[PDB]
């Protein structure tokens, strides 16, 4: 359940990200070594020895020296460490030393959730954010034709009724986007919908 690496690699290639995509990685992703080229990756919070827990997307624009982090719940760094034991200082330091003459970068990280609290669609949301980054690498988080299809909410409000229509609609728009843009998703639509559904993780 959730999405495998093979699934996410096929979808990212369908979305046109292939020229800049480094691949899928576990939490040891080393960072970007790319002072002159756009690059991006999908990175799990856990190590490969666990089989995967949660997907994030990292992307890098060499001309603005900006590393983007899109994690679908928009957790603070403290909550990423609390919930997922994930920290990414090392990969940011490697990226700045390898890819910027001044050893300085801007980190731009999402602060809102797009995903519902029982959903298993994290990897698919990362693939949609990387279509936006490959096409609008100066404004991938919002104000572009892909990310305008979905709406972030404060992660503190996730279990409140006033945001449930928005989170449902976000996952419906993610699947419609992947039907339009990914022949892999089209050919696997039912299977992936069932494995990643909005309430796939709901307590019983």
């Amino acid at each position: 359940m959730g999405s495998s690496e093979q699934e996410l690699k096929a979808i990212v290639k369908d979305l046109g990200c292939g020229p800049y995509f480094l691949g899928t990685y576990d939490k040891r992703f080393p960072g970007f070594v790319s002072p002159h080229k756009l690059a991006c990756a999908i990175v799990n919070t856990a190590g490969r020895e666990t089989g995967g827990v949660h997907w994030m997307a990292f992307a890098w624009n060499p001309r603005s020296k900006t590393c983007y982090l899109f994690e679908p719940f928009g957790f603070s760094d403290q909550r990423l460490k609390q919930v997922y034991q994930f920290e990414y200082e090392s990969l940011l330091r490697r990226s700045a030393i390898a890819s910027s003459p001044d050893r300085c970068i801007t980190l731009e990280k999402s602060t809102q959730s797009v995903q519902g609290p029982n959903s298993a669609a994290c990897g698919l949301f990362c693939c949609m954010f990387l279509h936006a980054f490959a096409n609008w690498p100066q404004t991938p988080m919002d104000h572009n034709p892909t990310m305008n299809l979905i709406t972030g909410v404060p992660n503190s409000m996730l279990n409140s009724p006033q945001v449930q229509p928005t989170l449902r609609r976000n996952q419906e728009q993610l699947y419609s986007f992947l039907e339009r843009h990914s022949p892999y998703f089209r050919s696997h639509s039912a299977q992936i919908r069932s494995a990643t559904s909005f309430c796939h993780l709901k307590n019983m």
Partner: peptide, 11 residues
């Protein structure tokens, strides 16, 4: 889309 925070980082 999502709102975001920008932080300058120097190494």
């Amino acid at each position: 889309g999502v709102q975001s925070l920008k932080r300058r980082r120097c190494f």
